[PDB]
Each structure stands twice: as C-alpha cells, then as structure tokens.
Copies of this chain bind each other. A is one copy, B any other.
Amino acid sequence: TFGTFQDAYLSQLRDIYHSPEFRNAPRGQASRERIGAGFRLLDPVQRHISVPARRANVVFNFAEALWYLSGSDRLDFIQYYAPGIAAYSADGRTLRGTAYGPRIFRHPAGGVNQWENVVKTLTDDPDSKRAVIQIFDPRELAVADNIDVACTLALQFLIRDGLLCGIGYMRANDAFRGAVSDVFSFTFLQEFTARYLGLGIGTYHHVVGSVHIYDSDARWAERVLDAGFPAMPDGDNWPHVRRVLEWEERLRTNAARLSADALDALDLPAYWKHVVALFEAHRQVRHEDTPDRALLAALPEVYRQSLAVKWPGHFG
C-alpha cells in the first residue's frame, strides 16, 4: 500500500532492478522480471511521476488518456506525442493491442460499449462485482507474427462506501516506461468515471502477471533510482472532453494556435483549459513556433515542472 503512485513506482522499480526473480528474453527482449506483482494506491489522483531524471511527459500522459476516451485506434494522433509507438503499428495507420480506446467503447467482441454498460451496471446495482471492462481479445494470439498484443486484461470498477475503486489487471507491464502511462490512464479513467457517477475517489489496485525492466532501459532506470496533481471537476466531463479533443486535433495538426491570454479566456473549466495549454505548448515545440512563457507560468506547478524538464530549451 502506497499513498501516491510515485512511491509505488519507485518501490517496484527498485524491487525489479535489484531483486529480479528471473532474467529472460520474451520475443528476444532481454529483461529483469518478477511474477505476480501489484500495489494499492490510496490517492489515485496523485498519479504523476516528478523525479527529474525520469523526464515523465505529462503531455503524453493526457494525450494517451484522451486518445482512449476518443475511442480511436489511429496512429497519427498518438505517435505525435510518442514517436516510438510507431514500432507497434503493422500498417503505419493504426495500433491494435496498444489502442485501448476501441476496446473500451466498441470492443471487437460484438462492438460493445463497455463503459456505458459498466455505468448502467453500477447504477442498477451499486454493490455490483460485475462492472468490468474487458480489454484483451481471444483472437489476438491467432494473428501470425502479431507485433501488438494487448497487455491489459481488464479494468474493474467497484462502488464501495460512496467511493469508486478501480482495479487494473495486466498480463505484463513495463515497470520503467509503460507503467507510468498505464497507471496514469487507468486512474484518469477511474476519476473520470467517479465524477460522472457523482462519487468520490477510492483506492486503485494494480495487478500484473509479468513486471519487468528491459535491459535496454537499465541505464535510465538506474539514473532514476540514484535520484499536487489537480482534481478533475465534478460531474459529467464528456462535454469538456469533446471540446478538448477538438482543440487537440487542431493544435496537433497546426491548424490552430492560441496565446496565453487566449488560453485563459477559453470557455472551459480551469482544469481542462490547462490540458489545452499543454497541447499548445507541445505544438510550439513540435511545429517550431515561439514558446510562450506566459503560458508556462499559468500552469499548475506539476505541469510546469514536467514541461521544464522535458523541454528545457523551450520551458527551462
């Protein structure tokens, strides 16, 4: 049990790096590994990693979570924030196992919107043990030479004492890289759903079959070992997400830009204005426009620190 994700993240990283159970090479990727590992977070909203040596990217973290909420499998959207994710696209256009959006909202088994069914299940029986979003699909292992097999099995939500608890079940999790964005996204979905249901945030449980540090990340993991997040507004945030996704697409494609004062004047809750400002900052970097230091100064300090460490030549 940990208070924040960063404490759990660093504890687990130390366990795997210094006390691995196995050394092996699944699909040729040499790794340190432990089997059957998990942790509990008492405060899932505190979902960010701020250790400067880790250079956690809060823009990618929100982008991935909103990519899921958009229901999209398109590579162009997410590789803009994480160019290396193109390695898992067989067609150069879409992602399969990596794209949890379609798994949540139009699952390959029947096209089912599982998020809606979970909300209906919890509304009809608040104590339900059945409110599960299935991610994995049985046909993924029937694909020959599949380069992108879902590694999350399911997400479960439970309403307990007026709080929404969440459980993420994964068959495998990269303890150094993937875990940072997976726990961010799963606790983001948990909070989003809690707000929608009018509930407080309960605990988050992460449970993983194989937790591992790839040997190719050993040096960076060692640098990290040698070294408040704001709350989403109450209620139904879908209208805000739709507007943020509109700004996301226009900024990513450089079809729009917004100054610091334009951002502050957007008709959005402050929480979501800051997410749009992250995307405008990222546009300045990727499309080589003038970095806006007034933009940076208006962000929450957690975001300011992420930007200054990720892009010190722009925001440092």
Contacts and interface: CB of A to CB of B under 8 A. Distances in A.
Contact of A137 (B109, B129, B140): B109
Nearest to A26: B127
Nearest to A37: B205
Contact of A151 (B127, B129, B134): B129
Size category, A interface: 35 or more
Contact of A109 (B132, B139, B153, B172): B139
Contacts of A114: 138, 141
Nearest to A121: B141
Interface of A: 21-22, 24-27, 35-36, 38, 40, 107-110, 112, 114, 117-118, 120-121, 124-125, 127-134, 136-142, 144, 149, 151, 153-154, 156, 158, 160-161, 165, 167, 169, 171-172, 203, 205, 207, 209-210, 212
B130 A167 contact: no
Given A160-B24, A207-B207, A153 B139 contact: no
B171 A153 contact: no
A294 to B, nearest CB: 44
Contacts of A142: 110, 112, 117
B36 A38 contact: yes
A127 B133 CA distance: 28
A27 B171 contact: no
A312 B261 CA distance: 83
B171 A156 contact: yes
A165 B125 contact: no
Sorted nearest first, the 4 A-B pairs with minimum C-beta distance are: A36-B205, A109-B109, A129-B172, A117-B141
Residue from A40, A161, A205 whose CB has the most chain B CB atoms within 10 Å: A205
Contact of A134 (B121, B133, B153, B172): B153
Contacts of A169: 153-154, 169, 207
Given A27-B125, A107-B138, A136-B154, 19 more contacts: A24-B127, A24-B160, A25-B127, A26-B127, A26-B129, A27-B127, A35-B165, A35-B167, A35-B205, A36-B205, A109-B137, A110-B139, A112-B142, A117-B141, A129-B171, A129-B212, A153-B153, A153-B154, A205-B209
A18 to B, nearest CB: 19
A153 B125 contact: no
A144 B149 CA distance: 31
Nearest to A140: B130
A118 B129 CA distance: 28
Contacts of A156: 171, 209
